[PDB]
Every structure is written in C-alpha cells, then in structure tokens.
Design a protein around this ligand. Structure first.
Ligand SMILES: [Mg+2]
Length: 361
C-alpha cells in the first residue's frame, strides 16, 4: 500500500538558530524535513503534507494569543519595556510555512519544500510574531491527525514525522469539574477509563470549544505549570511589582487594578498555574495536579492518536529542555509521543532514523 506522510515541524522560538549555544535547531530541522520529503516522494505513489507550528499552525491565517502577567485578582497587564501595559493579547498574520493537503503532485511538492523555514523568530527580530513562538505540540498533533483522518483511509499506510526540540510549553486544558464532590483524582481516572489501555484522555474531555487565547494553558514561558503563582524578581526570592507612574495612577485605579501604595504586585496569569483549582476560591487541587505541558499532550496523544494504529516518528534536534525541562524530560516526552521507544531518534542518530524508515523504502 502507498504511504501518506504528515511532517510536523516545530518552529517555536526555542528553535531559533542562536539558542543552546548556536545549536542551529531550525536550520537543522528544516534540512531534515527536506531530506524526508525527498526520500518519501522518490516513490511517486506516496503523499506528503507539512504542518509547521508554534503557538499555532503556521498556515498564513490570522491568530491571537494572550500575553502578560496579572495582579492579585487575575487582572492582566504587560510589564515589558517594549509594549503598552494594555497589550495582553496579540493578533497577527502567521507565516505560511505549511502544506495542508497530502500530495504527490511534483509541483505541489515543490511548493511544500519552498515553505520549509530554516529559521525561527528572534526576540529582537519581528517582536510581534515572536509572541506566537510557543510550542503548542498538542494542537499540531491534532492538525496532523485531522489531515490523515480526513484525507487518507484505513487501506493506506500513514506516518507522522515530527521534528522538534521536544519541549512543549502550551497545551489544551483537561476539563475537570470544580462543581461536583468527586475528587479531581477520581475525575481524572474516569477520563482514563474511556481509553482501552487507560493511557490517555479523549478529545471530548479537553476544553477545545473556544478561541485558543481564551482557553489554552501556558504561553510559551515554560514546560512547567507554576505552583507558586507569584512572579519573583529575577534571580531572587522576593515577589516583583509594577510601580505605577504618577500620570498613570488614576487611570489604573479606574480600570480596577489592585494597587498598594502605589505598586501592583505581579502574578503569573492563571493559565500558567498548576491546575485544576477552584475557580471561585482559587484553592489548588488537593488530589490530581497537572504540572507540565508534556503530560496533557501525552494523554491527548495516547487517547486520540496512538489508537489510530499508524506510525509516529519523532526526531530530536539539539535537545536540552529549553525552557523549564531537563534534557531527560524532553527525551521521555518525545518518546512518549512516538509509536515506540525506538521511534524517537536524535537527528544525530542517523542509524536510528535509517532503521525506522527502511521498512517503507
Ligand atoms: Mg519551543
């Protein structure tokens, strides 16, 4: 049977070529993709598609994300020196780095390959698109799956080939119910009960029905969700604050910020917090706690992708855990969202990559 392949390409900010002491993540990821496309399409029956992602799918559409910190009541502000404090969402047109239709047309293949980026955003380049540079792996997996389920069939061979540094920093929320007495652990367990092997959670028990910027967890800050909700002063122990200027003082009060003579003490916005937590009292869960983006992503993978019975190969590029994970956490995560242990390969591990692909070619 012919092979339909979706390439998943991580174009998050962590992939910028300067990162990890010039590890050239994006350049190397783009080259690996070029090589995979050429290899797959050598057989004229096979189809390819490309899903490049970061905070969202980079397909040339407009997207919105939330940014900033918040006061003690969850009221949002941006404390950056380069943005107005009201700038707590950003809206922009993404690069079209995707080819979203499986194809074996040679001219279409050429379009796909022309759309392969070799660089990611820089904090000093496009500062607007830099805001769309989180690692929302879950969303990209959902798009790759949607493509295969929509456009392939049970009789064709299907592959997801995912190239990334392995550190997701955004995820969809697990739909815990704060209003029943069932403990969060028992709620989580009931979600697991729905998958034959209990290793995942179905899409229906994620919060998906809303625009991303209002429902998603994480903003690219970290692999981790934060147990301490207070923003600390850099390198320190003490909570940071936003001094409100004289000229600015009355407008901020009017707006409703918590100002204590005359400082707004800063908290991570609540989509960065360990959850679930009671939405009224803010009491964190005393049982099950989600503490990374890796876990909800793996659960989604295992609930909704792995059962489809096709192959998922993950290729690690310059792997160190940036931001907020260790190198091992990143590997384990990548292995967690591959068909099996040996379908995670470092890009440097050419033997691993040759061996897995050999079956098809
Ligand atoms: Mg990243």
């Amino acid at each position: 049977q012919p092979l339909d392949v979706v390439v998943l390409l991580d174009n998050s900010n962590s992939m910028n070529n300067e990162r990890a002491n010039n590890s050239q993540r994006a350049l190397k990821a783009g080259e690996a993709v070029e090589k995979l496309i050429d290899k797959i399409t050598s057989n004229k029956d096979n189809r390819v598609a490309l899903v490049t992602y970061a905070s969202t799918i980079f397909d040339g559409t407009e997207a919105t994300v939330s940014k900033g910190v918040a006061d003690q009541n969850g009221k949002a502000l941006n404390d950056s020196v380069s943005w107005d404090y009201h700038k707590t969402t950003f809206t922009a047109t993404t690069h079209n780095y995707s080819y979203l239709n499986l194809t074996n047309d040679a001219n279409e293949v050429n379009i796909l390959k022309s759309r392969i980026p070799k660089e990611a955003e820089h904090i000093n380049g496009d500062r607007t698109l830099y805001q769309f540079g989180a690692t929302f792996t879950q969303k990209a997996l959902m798009k790759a799956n949607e493509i295969l389920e929509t456009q392939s069939s049970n009789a064709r061979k299907k592959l997801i080939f995912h190239v990334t540094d392995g550190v997701p920093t955004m995820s969809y929320a697990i739909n815990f119910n704060p209003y029943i007495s069932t403990s969060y652990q028992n709620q989580f367990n009931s979600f697991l009960n729905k998958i034959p092997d209990r290793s995942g959670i179905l899409q229906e028990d994620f919060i998906i029905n809303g625009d991303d910027y209002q429902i998603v967890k994480g903003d690219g800050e970290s692999f981790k969700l934060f147990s301490d909700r207070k923003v600390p002063v850099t390198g320190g122990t003490t909570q940071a604050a936003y001094r409100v200027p004289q000229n600015q003082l009355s407008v901020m009060s009017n707006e409703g910020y918590a100002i204590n003579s005359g400082y707004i003490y800063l908290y991570w916005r609540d989509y960065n917090w360990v959850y679930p937590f009671d939405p009224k009292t803010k009491k964190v869960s005393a049982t099950k706690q989600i503490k990374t983006h890796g876990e909800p992503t793996t659960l989604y993978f295992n609930g909704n992708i792995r059962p489809k019975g096709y192959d998922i190969f993950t290729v690690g590029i310059g792997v160190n855990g940036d931001p907020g994970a260790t190198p091992l956490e990143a590997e384990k995560f990548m292995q967690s969202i591959s068909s099996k242990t040996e379908n995670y390969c470092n890009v440097d591990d050419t033997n691993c990559i040759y061996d897995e692909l050999n079956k098809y070619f």
